[PDB]
Write a protein that binds this ligand. Structure first.
Ligand SMILES: NS(=O)(=O)c1cnc2cccnn12
Ligand SMILES: NS(=O)(=O)c1cnc2cccnn12
Ligand SMILES: [Zn+2]
Length: 140
């Protein structure tokens, strides 16, 4: 689990979005596993605007933050998970690291702020859904 809280926006994995998230929907993309909903109180997180390929992610299944190198956001084939079938996911970054289904929502962060959230796992890789292209998160 986990979300990004930026302004009056809540960024979550689409597959973990709640009824309240859908009832307060701003934007969702199944191909990216992202959903954004509205908040009443303002959030504590800042979005990275950058092309960093190094950062740190939170892994709930180790209760540890790991420094990782990660690929730039691409269209990647993902094998079947407890929450998705084998399919192609867009705006996905991969790193070598531990990721189980419950680790989805963990933040990846660089020196500029929040890069993305854990979205995929298996075979010793962790995949993160990028949010740095979503400039509209910073306003309105
Ligand atoms: N490496 S860690 O201390 O962050 C850790 C590993 N396993 C647990 C269980 C509870 C709390 N912390 N914890
Ligand atoms: N990725 S994070 O910095 O927001 C984080 C730190 N500790 C937890 C526990 C659950 C979800 N997320 N989380
Ligand atoms: Zn950065």
């Amino acid at each position: 689990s986990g979300a990004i809280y930026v302004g009056n926006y809540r960024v979550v994995n689409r597959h973990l979005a709640t009824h309240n998230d859908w009832a307060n929907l701003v934007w969702e993309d199944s191909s990216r596993d992202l959903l954004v909903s509205s908040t009443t109180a303002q959030g504590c997180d800042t979005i990275a605007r950058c092309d960093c390929q190094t950062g740190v992610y939170y892994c709930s299944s180790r209760r540890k933050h790991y420094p990782v190198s990660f690929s730039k956001p691409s269209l990647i084939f993902v094998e079947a998970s407890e929450y998705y079938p084998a399919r192609y996911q867009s705006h996905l970054m991969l790193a070598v690291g531990h990721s189980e289904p419950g680790d989805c929502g963990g933040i990846l962060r660089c020196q500029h702020g929040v890069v993305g959230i854990v979205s995929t796992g298996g075979n010793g890789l962790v995949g993160f859904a990028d949010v740095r292209d979503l400039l509209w998160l910073d306003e309105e």
